[PDB]
Design an enzyme around this catalytic site. Structure first.
Site, short mmCIF file in Angstrom:
data_model
loop_
_atom_site.label_atom_id
_atom_site.label_comp_id
_atom_site.label_asym_id
_atom_site.label_seq_id
_atom_site.Cartn_x
_atom_site.Cartn_y
_atom_site.Cartn_z
NE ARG A 123 -2.04 1.01 3.79
CZ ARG A 123 -1.57 2.03 4.53
NH1 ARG A 123 -1.69 3.30 4.11
NH2 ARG A 123 -0.97 1.79 5.69
CG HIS A 141 6.93 1.70 0.13
ND1 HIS A 141 7.25 3.05 0.16
CD2 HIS A 141 7.00 1.26 1.41
CE1 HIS A 141 7.50 3.41 1.41
NE2 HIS A 141 7.36 2.34 2.19
CG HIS A 194 10.48 -1.77 7.23
ND1 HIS A 194 9.35 -1.13 7.71
CD2 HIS A 194 10.85 -2.66 8.19
CE1 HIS A 194 9.05 -1.62 8.91
NE2 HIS A 194 9.94 -2.54 9.22
CG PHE A 195 11.41 2.23 0.03
CD1 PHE A 195 11.27 1.52 -1.17
CD2 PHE A 195 12.24 3.36 0.07
CE1 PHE A 195 11.92 1.93 -2.34
CE2 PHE A 195 12.91 3.78 -1.10
CZ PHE A 195 12.75 3.06 -2.32
CG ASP A 196 17.05 1.10 4.69
OD1 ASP A 196 16.50 1.34 5.79
OD2 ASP A 196 18.30 1.19 4.49
CE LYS A 200 5.35 6.78 5.30
NZ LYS A 200 6.15 6.27 4.17
CL LIG Z 1 9.94 5.87 1.79
#
Ligand SMILES: [Cl-]
Ligand SMILES: [Cl-]
Ligand SMILES: [Cl-]
Ligand SMILES: [Cl-]
EC number: 4.6.1.18
Length: 124
Positions: free
Chosen positions: A10, A12, A119-121, A41
């Protein structure tokens, strides 16, 4: 509660366009993905590749995450991405975002069975 894999999808994934089409892409996507519901965000990256290509990164180059964990992977190839970041006139509500399209490697943290992105790092 949303699972970590679903939350990553949702926040990314945007496999429906090859790239951001205009400057208003982020305002529209940050709203539709419910990332401006109770607060704006601040920063969020969307990846314009298939979900399968993004999941496949969990089997690619293992690299450290910024926080020091060792479950991050960097895509071998560059991917189309759009970074969305709040501008100075942004104020909940009326969130407002700058849209920056780029083609870069993505780095994601993976977890689970199946072992998928949670997670998007960063992007490089
Ligand atoms: Cl991000
Ligand atoms: Cl869900
Ligand atoms: Cl799930
Ligand atoms: Cl697709």
């Amino acid at each position: 509660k949303e699972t970590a894999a679903a939350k990553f999808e949702r926040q990314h994934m945007d496999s429906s366009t090859s790239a951001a089409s205009s400057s208003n892409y982020c305002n529209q996507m940050m709203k539709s993905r419910n990332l401006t519901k109770d607060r704006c965000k601040p920063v969020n990256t969307f990846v314009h590749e298939s979900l399968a290509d993004v999941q496949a990164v969990c089997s690619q180059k293992n690299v450290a995450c910024k926080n020091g964990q060792t479950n991050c992977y960097q895509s071998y190839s560059t991917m189309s991405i759009t970074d969305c970041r709040e501008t100075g006139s942004s104020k909940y509500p009326n969130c407002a975002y700058k849209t920056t399209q780029a083609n870069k490697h993505i780095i994601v943290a993976c977890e689970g069975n199946p072992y998928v992105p949670v997670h998007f790092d960063a992007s490089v």
